[PDB]
Amino acid sequence: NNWVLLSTVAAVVLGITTGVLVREHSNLSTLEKFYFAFPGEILMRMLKLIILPLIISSMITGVAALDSNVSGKIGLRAVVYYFATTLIAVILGIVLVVSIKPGSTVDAMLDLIRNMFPENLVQAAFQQYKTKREEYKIVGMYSDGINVLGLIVFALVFGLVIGKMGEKGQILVDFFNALSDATMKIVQIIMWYMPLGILFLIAGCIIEVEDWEIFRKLGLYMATVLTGLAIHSIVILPLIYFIVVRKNPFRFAMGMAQALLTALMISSSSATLPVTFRCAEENNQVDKRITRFVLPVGATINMDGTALYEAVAAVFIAQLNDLDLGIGQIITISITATSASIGAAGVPQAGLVTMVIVLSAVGLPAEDVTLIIAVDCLLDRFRTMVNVLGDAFGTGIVEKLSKKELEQMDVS
Ligand SMILES: [Hg+2]
Ligand code: NA
Ligand code: NA
Ligand code: NA
Prior knowledge:
Na-dicarboxylate_symporter, membrane, glutamate:sodium symporter activity, L-aspartate transmembrane transporter activity
C-alpha cells in the first residue's frame, strides 16, 4: 500500500504537535534545542550523502540512453524549458516584491563558469571555487560545498560520449545503469527512516523561532514568496503546459500528487526524484527515455521556486537595509538569482547556502540570511513542490515536442 505517504504525512501532524507543545511546555537551551533536532540532522546527512551518486549516475544513464542523433535536440529542448521557466519565475518574483513591497558583480558570474569546468573531479565532489578581489587582483580559493554545477556539466558530457562510443562503451552504460538503480533502492531505504526525521525536522524548526512575533514582521514577505510560488505553479506552469501539449494541465499535475505531496513533506527535489519517476511514467504514461533525462537534470538545475525565492528575498532584504533598488541594479539580482538556483543542490536549506551569492552581489551583508532563516523552513517546504512541479511539467512538455525523436527511437 501507500504507507510511505501516510507515515510521512503523520510526521507533519506529530511534528507540528510535538514542536508547539515542546516549545510551550519547556524552555530548551540553545544547546538543548540542537540535540532535540538530532534525528532530523541525521536524515539530512543521509539525504546529502546520496545526491552525489544520484546526480552522477542519473545524469549519465539518462543522457546515454538517448541516441546520439536525438540526444542533442532533446537536451536543447530541456534546457530552453528550464531557463524559460526559471527566468519567468524570477521575473514574476521580482515584479511581486516591487509591487507588494514586503519591506564584484562580474566576479560572481565568472565563478559560475569557473565551476562548470572544475580543475579536479574528485575535489569537485565536495569543494567549490570562489574568487575575490584583493590587494586589485583576483585571487581564488577552493572553499567547501559540493560542486553540483561542475559534476553535471561533466556527467552530461560523459553521458553523451559513452553513448556515442557504442558497443565499446556499453560496459560503462551498464555500470552506471546499475549504479543508478542501486541508488534508487538506497533512497527507498532512507524512505523508511524519513518519518522519524521529518517529525524532528519540523518540530525542531518551530522550536528555534523563539519570539513568535518575528513571523508578523516577516508576514508580508511570507505572502510574497507563497503568492509567487502559487502564481507560478497554478497559472504559469499549467499555462505553458496547455499551450504546448494542449491537454488538461491539472490532470497531469493531479497524477504527480504523490510526488508533489511527497515533495512538500520532505522538502528535497533529489530525495523525491524516485517518486517523480514513478508518478510521471505510471500515472501520466510518459516515455521512460524522456523522464530519465529531463527529471535528473531538472532536479538540480531547474529550480523555479528557488529562483523566485532568491530574487524575492534578496530584494526584500534590500528594502530592510533601506537601499534604493532602481532598474539598473535589480538586473544583477535577476541574473544572480537564476545562477544561484542553478548551482543549488537538491537538498533542503539549499536556498540558504546559495543566498550568499545573491546577497553579496547586490551589496548586502552575508549574515542577513539569519533575518529570514526563521521562516525559510516553511517557505522551503513549498519551494520544493514548485521545483518538482516545474520539472514534472517539463517531462510532459519535452516529451510532446520530442515526439518525432521518440518515434524514430522505437525503431532503432
Ligand atoms: Hg521546518
Ligand atoms: Na526552470
Ligand atoms: Na528541480
Ligand atoms: Na539548483
